[PDB]
């Protein structure tokens, strides 16, 4: 989320994540107003 440059849309990046503890709450401090659409899971119940 704090990278200097992002990859182009056609050559979109792919990152694998495993064996880690993820705190998604920090993702609410990115911008005062931003889209946070989630499919198949409620965002407020991602910490359980």
């Amino acid at each position: 989320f704090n990278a200097t440059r992002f990859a182009s849309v056609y050559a979109w990046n792919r990152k694998r994540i495993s064996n880690c503890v993820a705190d998604y709450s920090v993702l609410y401090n990115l911008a005062p107003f931003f889209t946070f659409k989630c499919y198949g899971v409620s965002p407020t119940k991602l910490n359980d």
Partner: protein, 48 residues
């Protein structure tokens, strides 16, 4: 059969969240918007 009194509550919710309107369920809507008792009796009608 007939009843003592009837309460009708109507609103509009997202498509994925329609399963959260049920006794004992948890999530954003169940916890922060609308909670049903465990020993609930009555019906729910949801249409697009």
């Amino acid at each position: 059969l007939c009843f003592t009194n009837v309460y009708a509550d109507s609103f509009v919710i997202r498509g994925d969240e329609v399963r959260q309107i049920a006794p004992g369920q948890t999530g954003n809507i169940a916890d922060y918007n609308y909670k049903l008792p465990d020993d609930f009796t009555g019906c729910v009608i949801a249409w697009n």
